[PDB]
Scaffold this active site. Structure first.
Site, PDB file in Angstrom:
ATOM      1  N   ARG A  48      12.099  -7.088   4.027  1.00  0.00           N
ATOM      2  CA  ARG A  48      11.742  -5.769   3.423  1.00  0.00           C
ATOM      3  C   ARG A  48      10.808  -4.989   3.907  1.00  0.00           C
ATOM      4  NH1 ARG A  48       9.735  -4.242  -2.258  1.00  0.00           N
ATOM      5  NH2 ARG A  48      10.554  -1.931  -2.037  1.00  0.00           N
ATOM      6  N   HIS A  85       8.022   4.458   0.320  1.00  0.00           N
ATOM      7  CA  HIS A  85       6.959   3.829  -0.103  1.00  0.00           C
ATOM      8  C   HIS A  85       5.620   4.362  -0.017  1.00  0.00           C
ATOM      9  CE1 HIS A  85       6.167  -0.756  -0.850  1.00  0.00           C
ATOM     10  NE2 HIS A  85       4.923  -0.085  -1.232  1.00  0.00           N
ATOM     11  N   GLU A  97       8.637   1.709  -6.496  1.00  0.00           N
ATOM     12  CA  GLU A  97       7.945   1.985  -7.569  1.00  0.00           C
ATOM     13  C   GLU A  97       7.512   3.449  -8.250  1.00  0.00           C
ATOM     14  OE1 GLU A  97       4.718  -0.525  -7.106  1.00  0.00           O
ATOM     15  OE2 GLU A  97       5.878  -2.293  -7.440  1.00  0.00           O
ATOM     16  N   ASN A 125      10.240  -5.506  -9.058  1.00  0.00           N
ATOM     17  CA  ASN A 125       8.739  -5.876  -8.642  1.00  0.00           C
ATOM     18  C   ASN A 125       7.903  -6.398 -10.104  1.00  0.00           C
ATOM     19  OD1 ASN A 125       9.682  -4.815  -6.234  1.00  0.00           O
ATOM     20  ND2 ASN A 125       7.892  -3.416  -6.077  1.00  0.00           N
ATOM     21  N   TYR A 140       4.651  -8.593 -11.426  1.00  0.00           N
ATOM     22  CA  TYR A 140       3.464  -9.604 -11.388  1.00  0.00           C
ATOM     23  C   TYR A 140       2.873  -9.951 -12.664  1.00  0.00           C
ATOM     24  CZ  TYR A 140       2.607  -7.501  -6.720  1.00  0.00           C
ATOM     25  OH  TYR A 140       2.951  -6.964  -5.136  1.00  0.00           O
ATOM     26  N   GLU A 159       9.573  -7.770  -5.006  1.00  0.00           N
ATOM     27  CA  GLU A 159       8.126  -7.935  -4.906  1.00  0.00           C
ATOM     28  C   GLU A 159       7.564  -9.090  -5.734  1.00  0.00           C
ATOM     29  OE1 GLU A 159       5.043  -5.310  -6.600  1.00  0.00           O
ATOM     30  OE2 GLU A 159       4.483  -4.560  -4.584  1.00  0.00           O
TER      31      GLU A 159
HETATM   32  C1  G2F Z   1       3.678  -3.480  -5.307  1.00  0.00           C
HETATM   33  O1  G2F Z   1       2.322  -3.986  -5.430  1.00  0.00           O
HETATM   34  C2  G2F Z   1       1.673  -4.634  -4.087  1.00  0.00           C
HETATM   35  C3  G2F Z   1       0.321  -5.145  -4.480  1.00  0.00           C
HETATM   36  O2  G2F Z   1      -0.511  -4.307  -5.482  1.00  0.00           O
HETATM   37  C4  G2F Z   1       1.598  -3.356  -3.340  1.00  0.00           C
HETATM   38  O3  G2F Z   1       0.850  -3.770  -2.147  1.00  0.00           O
HETATM   39  C5  G2F Z   1       2.810  -2.704  -2.987  1.00  0.00           C
HETATM   40  O4  G2F Z   1       2.824  -1.626  -1.893  1.00  0.00           O
HETATM   41  C6  G2F Z   1       3.721  -2.483  -4.000  1.00  0.00           C
HETATM   42  F1  G2F Z   1       4.889  -1.980  -3.822  1.00  0.00           F
END
Ligand code: G2F
Ligand code: NA
Length: 442
Positions: free
Chosen positions: A76, A120, A165, A292, A294, A351
């Protein structure tokens, strides 16, 4: 839950053009908002920029070597709009398209499926000079860019994402000011969010018309499962507000449900002007959704804070990385919600990963055990999600290699491979070898 992933599961790693490519002036590339922002004193924590980054414009073959050594079957990555239409709106730059054409051919020759992100965050600066995502015209020309790229690469790339995002681009870029272009106005951020969604919807339609074969088109959203710190009306409402601010504001219009009315009422006069015509465009049918993930948000009411008036209640018992709290169960929770409550399917994890204070040890390896444990725990939650029927088709570790981490610069390392930013040498971290061997076992 189960032990094994589907035999055709997509296993990859992820990057973005400005974070890795360098070569910011080469071969006709224009200026992006991130060139302007990172060259503005004080915007980046450590004085770095994307001018060189990982030099992946020249060294993507090394990146392919890493993906191959890891046994991945997909990559990706993003295409830089400034390389394709340097003026944002205007002629194409065939040298930019040819570069990505060669990259796509190199990936396919290696058995790596390209999963291409069109946007992006590297908006051409000439468009920002004309209000950027604050202007509807930016949505129109984004769709023109998407058309051109698919016309040339769509014979080989089936899986495309329009945006990565949009919450970040709108809210971090135009409301909180920590990302490019760096504006600090709620109304501009909400306007940007609408024009991002509109650009997404116009692009989907343009891409389907331009494509030489059927495409699988998605969008990529960061999602933060939100939990009230207590069951008080105040904390529950704070959780709802934060959940609307990050998640439902984007999920609902994409699902054909309009913007969430509770957030429209909360935003008041700062809400954007959204006619039914725009909303129909925004809901252009998609073939997949990229998640995505975290972290969670454990929300407490915060009346004196800026909108959405909700602060995180830290949990010192939970592990933390260099920059985030670890809560793997949130990945299961958000996927279960998407599967049962929203229409998008299949899903990809586009992600997931973590940042640590990685160093090359005396033996030459990078002993990032917390990152290995992070992957193990999140993959276990994906097995739970699959067991519940979630239609999950792939997983991309963020990131293939340490890179330019936006406002934290080169100082915040998310790679499964270590990048020496002085010599440009890459090395696989212990967590990357763990992924290699886990994937090989699948
Ligand atoms: C998703 O989060 C990461 C970590 O902050 C970033 O580097 C990516 O660009 C983002 F899409
Ligand atoms: Na820690």
């Amino acid at each position: 839950a189960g032990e094994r992933f589907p035999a055709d599961f997509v296993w990859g790693a992820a990057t973005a053009a400005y974070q890795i490519e360098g070569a910011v002036r080469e071969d006709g590339r224009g200026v992006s908002i991130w060139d302007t922002f990172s060259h503005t004193p004080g915007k980046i924590a450590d004085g770095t920029t994307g001018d060189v980054a990982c030099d992946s414009y020249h060294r993507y073959g090394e990146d392919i070597g890493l993906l191959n050594a890891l046994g991945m079957n997909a990559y990706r990555f993003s295409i830089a709009w400034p390389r394709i239409v340097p003026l944002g709106a205007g002629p194409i730059n065939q040298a930019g398209l040819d570069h990505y054409s060669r990259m796509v051919d190199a990936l396919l020759g290696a058995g790596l499926q390209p999963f291409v992100t069109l946007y992006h965050w590297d908006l051409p600066q000439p468009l920002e000079d004309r209000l950027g995502w604050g202007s509807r015209a930016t949505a129109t020309v984004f769709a023109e860019y998407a058309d051109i790229v698919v016309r040339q690469l769509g014979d080989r790339v089936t899986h495309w994402a329009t945006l990565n995002e949009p919450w970040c681009s709108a809210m971090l870029g135009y409301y909180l000011g920590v990302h490019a272009p760096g504006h600090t106005d709620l109304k501009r951020g909400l306007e940007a969010s609408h024009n991002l969604l509109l650009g997404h919807g116009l692009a989907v339609q343009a891409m389907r018309a331009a494509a030489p074969q059927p495409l699988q088109i998605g969008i990529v959203l960061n999602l933060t499962p939100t939990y009230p710190a207590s069951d008080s009306p105040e904390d529950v409402a704070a959780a709802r507000r934060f959940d609307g601010f990050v998640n439902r504001w984007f999920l609902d219009p994409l699902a054909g449900r309009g913007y969430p009315q509770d957030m429209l009422d909360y935003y008041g006069a700062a809400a954007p002007q959204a006619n039914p015509e725009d909303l129909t465009q925004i809901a252009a049918p998609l073939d997949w959704l990229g998640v995505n993930y975290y972290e969670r948000m454990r929300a407490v009411d915060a009346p004196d804070a800026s909108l959405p008036q909700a602060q995180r209640l830290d949990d010192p018992d939970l592990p933390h990385t260099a920059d985030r709290e670890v809560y793997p169960e949130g990945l299961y929770d958000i996927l279960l919600r998407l599967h049962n409550d929203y229409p998008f399917r299949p899903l990809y994890i586009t992600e997931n990963g973590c940042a640590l204070h990685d160093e090359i040890a005396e033996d030459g390896g990078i002993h990032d055990g917390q990152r290995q444990a992070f992957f193990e725990a999140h993959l276990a939650q994906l097995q739970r999600a699959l067991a519940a029927g979630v239609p999950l088709k792939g997983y991309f570790a963020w990131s293939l290699l340490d890179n330019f981490e936006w406002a934290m610069g080169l100082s915040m390392r998310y790679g499964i491979c270590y990048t020496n930013f002085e010599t440009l040498e890459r090395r696989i971290k212990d967590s990357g070898y763990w992924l290699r061997d886990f994937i090989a076992g699948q």
